Amino acid sequence: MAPPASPPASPKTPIEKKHADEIDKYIQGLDYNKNNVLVYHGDAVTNVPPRKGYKDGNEYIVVEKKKKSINQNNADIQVVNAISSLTYPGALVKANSELVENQPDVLPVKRDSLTLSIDLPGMTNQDNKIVVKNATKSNVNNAVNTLVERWNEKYAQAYPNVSAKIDYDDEMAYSESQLIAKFGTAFKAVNNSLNVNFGAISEGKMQEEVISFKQIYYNVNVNEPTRPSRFFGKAVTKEQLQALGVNAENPPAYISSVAYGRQVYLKLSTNSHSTKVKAAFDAAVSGKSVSGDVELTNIIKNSSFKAVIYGGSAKDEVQIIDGNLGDLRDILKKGATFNRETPGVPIAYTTNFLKDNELAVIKNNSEYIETTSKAYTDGKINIDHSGGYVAQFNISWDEVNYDPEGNEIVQHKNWSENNKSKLAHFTSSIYLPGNARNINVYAKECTGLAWEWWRTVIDDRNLPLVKNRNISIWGTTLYPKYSNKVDN
C-alpha cells in the first residue's frame, strides 16, 4: 500500500490553533542529520589471533581467524516478541538509542485522528481504510481487527490461498555483536532460547548458522500528516513536548507501518569442519535437499536445528523445537498461507520522522573475528614384500606445523626402515599424522647382475595422504611386480 489520506481536521479554538502552529515550528526547527540519528556501533576488533595447528585424536586441526566487518543500514525495525503489544501503527516514539535497542520510548501525549490502511488483497480503496478518532493503543488495535474482519467477510472467499510475503535472513554466526548488526538488538531476546555457542565456534569445534524466517500476512500503514502537529491532541503544547524530552537529540517519530504475521528463528549447528556447511544448510532449508551428493548429505545427517516460533498459533503462544536437520521443511512448511485462526503478530515495523515524514533508517556497523577450521585425517602406508629377492625401500614425507605467529614450519621425515635390506615375507605399517603431505614411495630390488645390481621397482612422488595406502611388491629378480592401491 501507499499511505492513506489524512482524516479531516478536528475543530480548534483560536488558542488551540496557535498551539498547533507553535508545535509545527518547533518540530520543523529541529536540526539533526536523519542519516546519523539511529546507529548501532558494534565491537571493535583490536587484533586477530595467529593461525594455529594441533593434533586431536586421529586428526590434525588447523584453525584460521580473519577480521571481518558487517556494515548495514536497516529500515525495518525488529520486534521483541514479549513486548510486541507495544508496537502498533501510528504510535509516537522518540528516535534515539532505545529505538535501536528495540524498546523505544513512547511519547505519552494525547492523540488526534489518523487513517489506517491494510494491504490485504482484493479490497477497494474505500474498504481498506478506517478513521481512528483517538489514536490510543486500544483504539488502533481494535481498528486493525476491524479491517481484518472486513476482509474475512468480503474477500476471503475470493482469495483462498494468498501466499504470505517472505522476509528471509541468514548468517553464519561468529559473535553477538555481528548478529545484532544483522538481526537487530531483538536477537538478544531470541538468543536466550537459541543459545548460540560463540565459544565453540571460536575454537573451531563447531559451525552454526542463524536464520530469520518471516511470513508476513499483511501490513497496516498510517496516513502521512502534512503538519507535524496533526498527530497531537488539541491540548498538547510545545512546552509539554519539550518537558518530555522531545528535541534535536531525541527527534519525534511515528510508526508508519507494521508487518503482521509469523516468524521463525533458526539455529543450525554441526560439529563438521567442512567448508560446504553453508551450502548443506541452504539445501536442507530450500527443499533442494539433494541426497545425490554424499558430502552435503553427510553434513545434514550430522547437523541439528533449534527453532523459536512466534505468531504461529491462535494466541500469543511461543513454540520451541529441537531436532535433526533432515526433519526440517515441516516447520517451514506451515504458515505459508494466512487464515482466520492464525491472524499473526507484529514482527516488523517502519518509522518516519515527524519533521518531514522521512524514513528513519538504523545504521549498523560491527567488526568480528571469523573463525574457519580444517580437519586432516591420519593415514597409514602398508608395506608388503613377498618377492623372491632382496628389497630396499625409501619412503619420505613432509609434516607441516605452525610457529607461534602462525607461519608454516615444514619438517622433512624419513621412514626408519629406509635403505635397509628386507627379505620376504616382510610387512610393516607407517603411521602418518594428519599434517603430512607429499608422500614419496621408492623401492628397489637386488637382481645380482653386474650391469644392473639394483633395479627400481617403484618411484612414486608427491602422493596425497590417504587413509590406507597399500604398497605391495612381489615377483622375481627378473620380473618384479608391484601395486600402489588406495583405501582397499
| Interacting residue ranges for Na ion, rule: CB under 5 A | 34, 40, 43, 70, 78, 85, 88, 109-111, 134, 141, 169-170, 175-177, 183-184, 186, 188, 191, 207, 212, 236, 240, 281-282, 353, 355-356, 358, 364, 371
Q: How far from the centroid of its chain's Cα atoms is residue 172's Cα?
A: 5
DSSP SS3 for 439: strand
Cβ(253)–Cβ(351) below 8 Å: yes
Of residues 150 and 188, the one with the C-beta less far from Na ion: 188
Of residues 142 and 163, the one with the C-beta less far from Na ion: 142
Of residues 21 and 356, the one with the C-beta less far from Na ion: 356
Joined together, the cell numbers standing for residue 472 give 605391495
**What is the spatial distance between Cα 384 and Cα 391, in angstroms, rounded to a whole number?**
11
Of residues 175 and 250, the one with the C-beta less far from Na ion: 175
Q: Nearest approach, Cβ of 449 to Na ion (angstroms)?
A: 45
Q: Nearest approach, Cβ of 153 to Na ion (angstroms)?
A: 22
**What is the spatial distance between Cα 49 and Cα 482, in angstroms, rounded to a whole number?**
47
**What is the spatial distance between Cα 379 and Cα 399, in angstroms, rounded to a whole number?**
13
Strands 468-475 vs 379-385: parallel, antiparallel or unpaired: parallel
Contacts of 69 by beta carbon, 8 Å cutoff, 6+ apart = 365, 366, 367, 368
Cis omega (within 30 of 0) on the bond before 41?
no
Q: Nearest approach, Cβ of 2 to Na ion (angstroms)?
A: 20
Of residues 238 and 355, the one with the C-beta less far from Na ion: 355
**What is the spatial distance between Cα 31 and Cα 23, in angstroms, rounded to a whole number?**
15
Cβ(380)–Cβ(432) below 8 Å: yes
Q: Nearest approach, Cβ of 120 to Na ion (angstroms)?
A: 18
Joined together, the cell numbers standing for residue 401 give 606445523
**What is the spatial distance between Cα 201 and Cα 208, in angstroms, rounded to a whole number?**
7
Of residues 327 and 356, the one with the C-beta less far from Na ion: 356
Contacts of 87 by beta carbon, 8 Å cutoff, 6+ apart = 79, 255, 258, 346, 349
Contacts of 119 by beta carbon, 8 Å cutoff, 6+ apart = 1, 128, 218, 219, 220, 221
Strand partners, 66: 370
**What is the spatial distance between Cα 361 and Cα 164, in angstroms, rounded to a whole number?**
25
Of residues 109 and 131, the one with the C-beta less far from Na ion: 109
Query: Where does 403-435 show beta strands of DSSP type E?
Result: 408-414, 426-432
Q: Nearest approach, Cβ of 322 to Na ion (angstroms)?
A: 15
Of residues 317 and 459, the one with the C-beta less far from Na ion: 317
Cβ(57)–Cβ(205) below 8 Å: no
Which conformational region is residue 323 in: left (phi greater than 0), alpha (psi within -120 to 50 degrees), or beta?
A: left
